[PDB]
RNA sequence: AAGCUCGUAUCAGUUUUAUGAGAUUAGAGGUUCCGGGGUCGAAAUGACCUUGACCUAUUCU
RNA sequence: UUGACAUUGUGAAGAGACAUAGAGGGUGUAGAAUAAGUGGGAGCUUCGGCGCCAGUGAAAUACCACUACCUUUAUAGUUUC
RNA sequence: GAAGACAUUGUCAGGUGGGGAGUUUCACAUCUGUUGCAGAUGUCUAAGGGGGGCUCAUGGAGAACAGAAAUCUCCAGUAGAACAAAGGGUAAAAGCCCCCUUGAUUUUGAUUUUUGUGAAUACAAACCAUGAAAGU
């Protein structure tokens, strides 16, 4: 209350560390407690975020989840007290999802791991390049709760990554969501999750498919029209030469006419 | 003002009091002001600048660029002067840490993250195409402005307040507020 | 001052008869025992028919 | 009700004349790589086993 | 019912704070070692102990500046209890 | 005897006080809660001008891989196409493509919708775009 009893906090963080070592489940009482104290603002310190990092890097599922939900809660200020976020994300993606393919986590937990990885990556300009092929298995409309997965796909995109590994993603989505015969919600979800990719990685889809997607402006369904207008207004301010003359809306065209001579 | 001139004059005289440590003392400006909280994302970034950093740059390039910049007095590299380096993290980190900055051709800023990916992006010296003062987490911010030119100090100060005590310093000299 | 509905609503977080007792939902239930009644003017004639006595022949399609 | 500009001819509960204005795949099989059971597997993205959902050919407009 | 003022005078001893002047500090792991952090860089040298070049580490140590926190030393006075 | 600068007493200021008084009775849709909700994010809220060229939807016949749908050629086709889902209007266009521009510009008054504006409407002077031009 008055002043932070460092002699006490530093002592009762050591027991959390020495609980998380015991690999059965006993770090539950460290994670559940450190989350409470962070929420009450009593343990705002660099020493504590390491505990939840180690929990996220643990083998027990209910401890890993406590760590992941701590670092989630859009993320919290604890990211700004990490020691190496890039190596953290690399170790997570290597241990849990891809490395051994132990298949311990269910889909509801895999999605929460994906959310954390993508939201760290987009925020801190990280580079892993395995993410973008791991998503492709799950990017199918016949898959369980894909609107969460594709909303994290965009969150791992940058201005500073090779756009080919995102081109393959966009061409998977385009092949499987805005193809022939697909439904209105499916096509609208595809276009909406592509334009919010291109808002971070603009040169990740080329003009030839950009035009194929702005085809769907006057689509009579009111989902695909609202979606295509967003892509058009996105590339009207960024790369309006990829768009055709029909779409450059009275100022992009005037800016191009003066700057083309 | 010319209250900068009296400061810089006997700084240049301190130039000739403890003369030489057999190098050249660069000039620096340290910014101190309050009223902002960087733990919230109040971020700033601006690169509208022009020095003498004992220029040590490493350009990556092609045949068209390596024999362009063999002149110039510059360290240069092939693409497979980089391809045959990924096997050793501390090796690819030592070149990371060697040079003050990095540049590369317009072709190789698609391939450089596959090779020098984790490094060279958090370090804040990622290359830039050819043919900074980031408010990351702290209130403290120092920038190297020049060498042993009173204009440059004000030139940078108006830009910093443009973006938003002031101190000027040399390598071992004292502080002048 | 602490025993005021204003202060109660402030410290905690509309219908006639909401107190420390008897929230919204409860007042409506307890009004059922009384106001299944028939409204009239002063001279005497129906303004508002009783509940479940509207007396309008709908379009039954 | 009290009046005040003046006493034209304009008016009219009327007429005349012209003229406009959804559910069905049983029958075949492929997948779920998040649902995995089965003899087996130090070890295995298997022989096959079913729950399935999936892509299908049907019917009305 | 609890607080302030007044009635309300004569004495004493203690604790806390304003306000200045100071003084020092940092173990998750690895690393010689207990790394706030940031920025300049490869000696002022009593020693050339050393700083650079060498690991290990997100971050590298001399030398000199910046401006964050934490803990303590003294009472011109200031007051409160 | 006790007690003592406290209690008390006086004035202010918070709290309690039905004991008592007076009185009333614009949008599809991933992201947090109540139940299948009101709320929070982000996401739509929209290219007009004047010149030229050309006809659309659909069907039939026909061509290696090529099939009901990939590209090509011919015939029919008053609109069955498109123009922000059974409706009016539009076919050398009011539609698609192409060329040039950005009159979606200022000043002076007039009319209808409407006393308040806005909206649309025509009207003249200038700067302008367009086409060879009429003219817009």
**Integer Cα distance of B74 and B88 in angstroms:** 24
Enumerate helices (H) and strands (E) in chain B, giving the number of each: 6, 6
CB spacing of B113 vs A129 below 8 angstroms:
yes
**Which of the nucleotides lies closest to A142 (Cα–C1')?**
D54
Given a contact cutoff of 8 angstroms between Cβ atoms, the answer to whether B69 and B91 are in contact is no
Kindly list the distances between the CA atom of residue A51 and the CA atoms of A47, A69, A240, in Å, as whole numbers in the listed order: 7, 13, 48
CB spacing of B111 vs A125 below 8 angstroms:
no
Token pair of A50 as six digits: 């390491």
User: In sequence order, what are the residues at sequence separation of 6 or more whose Cβ sits closer than 8 angstroms to the Cβ of residue A76?
Assistant: none
A with C: touching (≥3 Cβ pairs within 8 Å)? no
Q: CA angle A152-A156-A158, nearest 5°? A: 140
CB spacing of A127 vs B122 below 8 angstroms:
no
What are the E-state strand segments in chain B? 27-31, 57-60, 75-77, 101-104, 141-146, 167-170
Q: Which residue has the tokens 């050591």?
A: A14
Given a contact cutoff of 8 angstroms between Cβ atoms, the answer to whether B76 and B58 are in contact is yes
**Integer Cα distance of A231 and A187 in angstroms:** 14
Q: Which residues pair with B27 in a beta bridge?
A: B146, B170
**Integer Cα distance of A118 and A178 in angstroms:** 24
**Integer Cα distance of C24 and C17 in angstroms:** 8
Token pair of A184 as six digits: 């209105």
Given a contact cutoff of 8 angstroms between Cβ atoms, the answer to whether A50 and A84 are in contact is no
Min Cα distance B133 → chain A (Å) is: 16
Count CA atoms closer than 13 A to B174's CA, side-chain side. Answer: 11
Residues of A with CB under 8 A from a CB of B: 77, 80, 86-87, 90, 125, 127, 129, 160-164
User: In sequence order, what are the residues at sequence separation of 6 or more whose Cβ sits closer than 8 angstroms to the Cβ of residue A219?
Assistant: A225, A228
Instruction: Give the gyration radius of chain B's Cα atoms.
Output: 19
Token pair of A180 as six digits: 């022939």
B with A: touching (≥3 Cβ pairs within 8 Å)? yes
Chain B residue numbers touching A127 (CB-CB < 8 A): 113, 117-118, 121
Tell me the residue length of chain A: 261
Helix residue ranges, H only, B15-150: 63-66, 80-83, 89-98, 112-115
What are the E-state strand segments in B27-104? 27-31, 57-60, 75-77, 101-104
In 3D space, the residue among A47, A42, A68 whose CA is nearest the CA of residue A57 turns out to be: A68
Interatomic CA–C1' length for residue B141 and nucleotide E67, angstroms: 9
**Which of the nucleotides lies closest to A140 (Cα–C1')?**
D32
Q: Which residue has the tokens 């609107």?
A: A147
Strand D-proximal protein residues, Cβ less than 7 Å = A 101, 103-107, 110, 137, 142, 144, 181
Fill in the DSSP letter of residue C49: P
Q: β-pairing, B141-146 with B57-60? A: unpaired
Chain A residue numbers touching B110 (CB-CB < 8 A): 162-164
**Integer Cα distance of B82 and A129 in angstroms:** 18
Chain A residue numbers touching B122 (CB-CB < 8 A): 86, 125
Neighbours of A105 (CB within 10 A): 16
Q: Which residues pair with B103 in a beta bridge?
A: B59
User: In sequence order, what are the residues at sequence separation of 6 or more whose Cβ sits closer than 8 angstroms to the Cβ of residue B105?
Assistant: B59, B60, B61, B62, B64, B65, B129, B130, B131
Count CA atoms closer than 13 A to A86's CA, side-chain side. Answer: 13
In 3D space, the residue among A101, A107, A70, A108 whose CA is nearest the CA of residue A88 turns out to be: A70
Neighbours of A19 (CB within 10 A): 18
In 3D space, the residue among A238, A242, A240 whose CA is nearest the CA of residue A250 turns out to be: A240
Given a contact cutoff of 8 angstroms between Cβ atoms, the answer to whether A242 and A235 are in contact is yes
Kindly list the distances between the CA atom of residue A135 and the CA atoms of A88, A119, A139, A186, A203, in Å, as whole numbers in the listed order: 19, 15, 6, 17, 20
Helix (H) or strand (E) holding B9: helix B3-14
Given a contact cutoff of 8 angstroms between Cβ atoms, the answer to whether A188 and A224 are in contact is yes
Chain B residue numbers touching A160 (CB-CB < 8 A): 113, 121, 126
Residues in chain A followed by a break, C to N above 2.5 angstroms: 73
How far is C-alpha B152 from the chain's CA centre? 15
In 3D space, the residue among C12, C29, C28 whose CA is nearest the CA of residue C20 turns out to be: C12
Min Cα distance A126 → chain B (Å) is: 7
User: In sequence order, what are the residues at sequence separation of 6 or more whose Cβ sits closer than 8 angstroms to the Cβ of residue A27?
Assistant: A16, A19, A20, A55, A58, A60, A63
For the sheet with B101-104, list strands across it.
Answer: B75-77, B57-60, B101-104
Residues of B with CB under 8 A from a CB of A: 39, 110-111, 113-114, 117-118, 121-122, 126, 137
Token pair of A102 as six digits: 């132990």
Q: Which residues pair with B170 in a beta bridge?
A: B27
CB spacing of B121 vs A125 below 8 angstroms:
yes
Give exposure, B36-51, as e/b (b: 16+ Cβ within 10 Å): eebeeeeeeeeeeeee
Residue B93, CB, less than 7 Å from strand E? Answer: yes
User: In sequence order, what are the residues at sequence separation of 6 or more whose Cβ sits closer than 8 angstroms to the Cβ of residue B23?
Assistant: B171
**Integer Cα distance of C22 and A171 in angstroms:** 60
Kindly list the distances between the CA atom of residue C26 and the CA atoms of A210, B71, B116, C8, C9, in Å, as whole numbers in the listed order: 58, 89, 68, 18, 17
**Integer Cα distance of B94 and B87 in angstroms:** 13
**Integer Cα distance of A252 and A239 in angstroms:** 9
Neighbours of B115 (CB within 10 A): 18
**Integer Cα distance of B11 and B130 in angstroms:** 38
Three-state secondary-structure class, residue B144: strand
Q: Which residue has the tokens 């920038």?
A: B143
How far is C-alpha B118 from the chain's CA centre? 20
Q: CA angle A120-A124-A125, nearest 5°? A: 110
Helix residue ranges, H only, chain A: 6-20, 28-39, 46-56, 61-72, 85-92, 107-124, 131-138, 146-153, 164-177, 184-198, 207-214, 224-235, 252-259
**Integer Cα distance of C7 and C13 in angstroms:** 10
Q: Which residues pair with B168 in a beta bridge?
A: B29, B176
Resolution value in angstroms: 3.1
Q: Is the four-CA dihedral B23, B27, B33, B37 of positive or negative sign?
A: negative
Report the phi/psi class of residue B55: left, alpha or beta, with left for phi > 0 and alpha for psi in -120 to 50.
Answer: beta
Residue A144, CB, less than 7 Å from strand F? Answer: no
Q: Which residues pair with B29 in a beta bridge?
A: B143, B168
Kindly list the distances between the CA atom of residue B61 and the CA atoms of A47, A215, A248, in Å, as whole numbers in the listed order: 44, 40, 37
In 3D space, the residue among A120, A130, A187 whose CA is nearest the CA of residue A156 turns out to be: A120
In 3D space, the residue among A153, A155, A95 whose CA is nearest the CA of residue A123 turns out to be: A155
Q: Is the four-CA dihedral B144, B146, B148, B154 of positive or negative sign?
A: negative
Q: Is the four-CA dihedral A196, A197, A200, A203 of positive or negative sign?
A: negative
Three-state secondary-structure class, residue C9: helix
DSSP string spanning A86-123?
Answer: HHHHHHHIIIIIIIS----S-HHHHHHHHHHHHHHHHH
Q: Which residues pair with C40 in a beta bridge?
A: C46
Q: β-pairing, B101-104 with B57-60? A: parallel
Name the experiment that determined this structure: cryo-EM
């Amino acid at each position: 209350t008055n002043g932070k009893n460092q002699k006490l906090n530093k002592s009762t963080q050591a027991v959390c560390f020495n609980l998380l070592d015991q690999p059965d489940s006993q770090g539950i009482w460290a994670t559940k407690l450190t989350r409470e104290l962070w929420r009450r603002g009593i343990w705002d310190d660099s020493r504590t975020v390491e505990i939840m990092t180690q929990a996220a890097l643990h083998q027990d599922v209910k401890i890993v989840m406590s760590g992941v939900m701590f670092f989630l809660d859009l993320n919290f200020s604890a990211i700004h007290l990490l020691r190496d976020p890039q190596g953290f994300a690399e170790k997570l993606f290597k241990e849990h999802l891809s490395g051994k393919t132990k298949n311990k986590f269910d889909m509801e937990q895999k999605i929460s791991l994906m959310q954390l990885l993508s939201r760290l990556i987009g925020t801190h300009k990280l580079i892993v390049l395995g993410i973008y092929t791991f998503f492709l298995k799950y990017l199918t409309p016949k898959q369980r709760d894909v609107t969460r997965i594709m909303s994290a796909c965009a969150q791992a995109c940058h201005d500073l990554v090779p756009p080919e590994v995102i081109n393959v993603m966009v061409r998977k989505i385009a092949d499987e969501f805005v193809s022939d015969g697909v439904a209105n919600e499916v096509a609208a979800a595809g276009i909406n999750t592509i334009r919010e990719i291109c808002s971070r990685a603009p040169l990740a889809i080329d003009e030839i498919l950009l035009q194929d997607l702005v085809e769907y402006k006057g689509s009579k369904a009111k989902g695909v029209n609202m979606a295509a207008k967003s892509l058009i207004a996105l590339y009207r301010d960024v790369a309006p030469e990829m768009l055709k003359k029909k779409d450059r809306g009275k100022n992009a065209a005037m800016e191009v006419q003066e700057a083309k001579k | 003002s010319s209250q900068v001139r009296e400061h810089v004059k006997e700084l240049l005289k301190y130039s000739n009091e403890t003369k030489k440590r057999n190098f050249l003392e660069t000039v620096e400006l340290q910014v101190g002001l309050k009223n902002y909280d960087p733990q919230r994302d109040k971020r700033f970034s601006g690169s509208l600048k022009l020095p003498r950093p004992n220029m040590s740059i490493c350009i990556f390039g092609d045949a068209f660029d390596v024999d362009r910049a063999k002149s110039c007095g510059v360290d240069a590299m092939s693409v497979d002067d980089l391809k045959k380096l990924n096997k050793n993290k501390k090796l690819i980190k030592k070149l990371s840490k060697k040079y003050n900055a990095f540049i590369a051709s317009e072709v190789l800023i698609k391939q450089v993250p596959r090779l020098l990916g984790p490094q060279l992006s958090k370090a804040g010296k990622f290359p830039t195409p050819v043919s900074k003062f980031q408010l990351k987490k702290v209130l403290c911010l120092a920038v190297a402005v020049g060498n042993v030119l009173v204009n440059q100090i004000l030139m940078s100060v108006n830009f910093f307040v443009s973006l938003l005590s002031l101190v000027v310093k040399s390598s071992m000299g004292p502080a002048f507020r | 001052t602490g025993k005021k509905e204003k202060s109660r609503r402030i410290r905690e977080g509309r219908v006639k008869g909401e107190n420390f007792y008897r929230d919204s939902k409860r007042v409506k239930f307890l009004n059922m025992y009384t106001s299944g009644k028939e409204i009239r003017n002063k001279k005497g004639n129906l303004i508002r028919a009783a509940s479940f006595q509207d007396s309008t022949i709908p379009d039954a399609r």
